[model samples]
Target: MAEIQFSKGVAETVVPEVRLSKSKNGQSGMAKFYFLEPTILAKESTDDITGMYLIDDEGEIITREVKGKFINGRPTAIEATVILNSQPEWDRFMRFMERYGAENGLGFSKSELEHHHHHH
Candidate 1:
């Protein structure tokens, strides 16, 4: 069996701003960006001010400029596409994918299983 470990960190210091107003384009009222780590938040205040992180089904941390939906001055959910990088991230994603496939009607393709490399 493959051993698993998790990163030690928590999200803190989240500040949201209104980059665009709905009145201007009939879009969302506001967008909020969150820095996954405190250090990254500190750095963004001086460095790039437009970076956000999103986690996938298996906890792969993704860095991107995300757009959030808001209604009545409250933030709503945002759906963004992501790609998995790094071996550990792929391993986690693959495990969930396999488990989901096994329990659900969706079955993994033979090529997917054949090309998959296990790492612990």
Candidate 2:
């Protein structure tokens, strides 16, 4: 598990729940961050930085795809993705994870082995 913060000069967004999965080689992976607040949706997008890129916090600026549910035209929650595709990228994330883990009283552990069996 990991947590990250984003600032857009108005308010800070904290990704409280994060799910992660990596490829067979451990280099390529994907992380999905989810956040929901009762009255914080407006603060999350009150500005425009979080709408542009993953360019803040933890000193690890990466690219991300921020998707939000706009049903009824009211942004309710956020589901963001920061993709990983190489060694350096993962390495960078791991470092950030260490720091994030420390600050938030969280730790990282290797989960049960995964079998990415190829079919066909």
Candidate 3:
């Protein structure tokens, strides 16, 4: 299994906010909640990002990963409550997403997932 390092305290980032209006069962659940933004709005990186991805070619090595949810628009602080979901269960895959659009050749770390980006 891969390990994640949290030397910088915690990984976070603030992605562009999005509007979500759907349910897990493909039905209209509610129109008040905006999902996927809190985690995308975090202000830290779980790790170098590359290490988070780069799993086996099949990429089935990771499961149950979570990202930090930011409140008040910016990622200055974690939200009072964490909005959890199962779509991003694979901890490594989520990390890999962070590596998206990033420079290549990032180094790998022995401490994976220890960081808050997907620690929970």
Best by TM-score: 2
Model 3 Cα RMSD, Å?
13.8
* lDDT agreement with native, every candidate: 0.34, 0.51, 0.31
> Pick by lDDT: which candidate is best?
2
Rank by lDDT (best first): 2, 1, 3
Cα RMSD (Å) between model 2 and the true structure?
12.8
Report the poorest 10 consecutive residues by lDDT, candidate 3.
76-85
**lDDT accuracy of residue 80 in candidate 3:** 20
- Where in model 3 is the C-alpha error above 4 Å? 4-23, 26-58, 61-68, 76-120
The predicted structure with the larger lDDT, 1 or 3, is 1
TM-score of 2: 0.55
Q: How displaced is residue 81 in candidate 3, in Å?
A: 16
Ranking by TM-score: 2, 1, 3
Report the C-alpha lDDT of model 1 over 1-120, residue by residue, as the tens digit. 111112113232222221212324643233233212224323333233233443334454543544444357543433222234344655654564455334332322223333333432
lDDT measured at residue 94 in model 3 versus the true structure, 0 to 100: 45
TM-score to native of every candidate shown? 0.26, 0.55, 0.19
